[PDB]
Design a protein around this ligand. Sequence first.
Ligand SMILES: Cc1cn([C@H]2C[C@H](OP(=O)(O)O)[C@@H](COP(=O)(O)O)O2)c(=O)[nH]c1=O
Ligand SMILES: [Ca+2]
Length: 136
Amino acid sequence: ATSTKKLHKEPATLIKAIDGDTVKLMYKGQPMTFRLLLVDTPEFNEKYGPEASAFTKAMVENAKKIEVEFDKGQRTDKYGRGLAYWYADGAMVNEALVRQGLAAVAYVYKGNNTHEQLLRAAEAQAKKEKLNIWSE
Ligand SMILES: Cc1cn([C@H]2C[C@H](OP(=O)(O)O)[C@@H](COP(=O)(O)O)O2)c(=O)[nH]c1=O
Ligand SMILES: [Ca+2]
């Protein structure tokens, strides 16, 4: 089975920050746009959008080391974007954004949701504290 298999972190280098949930990284020596697994962030024209983008930008740009961790299902979406959990010096970007109430758990599929419970826990706490998107 694959449900109990482990995930592995891989090195990547920041090329440029994009927005709340996408980033341009050099992976295996090639440029790629990565999308955060299991989340949905407000866009630039939406409330908390500029905040989410700023949060992710700072987290990735100030990271000494960036790593990507693909899940066990789809590694690239229909738009050619890499689907992964990103880590900035050991801290998961997907989790951090949700914990601050700057993103919501979304796009949770099959065997591509290894960190679902972890993220839902962060969302519950962000909602309890009425942080950002949960203050409405
Ligand atoms: C996060 C994620 C997004 N996507 C696709 C679905 C959405 O396209 P459709 O709307 O055409 O189906 C789009 C959402 O991305 P954004 O939220 O960046 O716009 O990315 C996946 O296919 N798998 C994923 O795991
Ligand atoms: Ca989004």
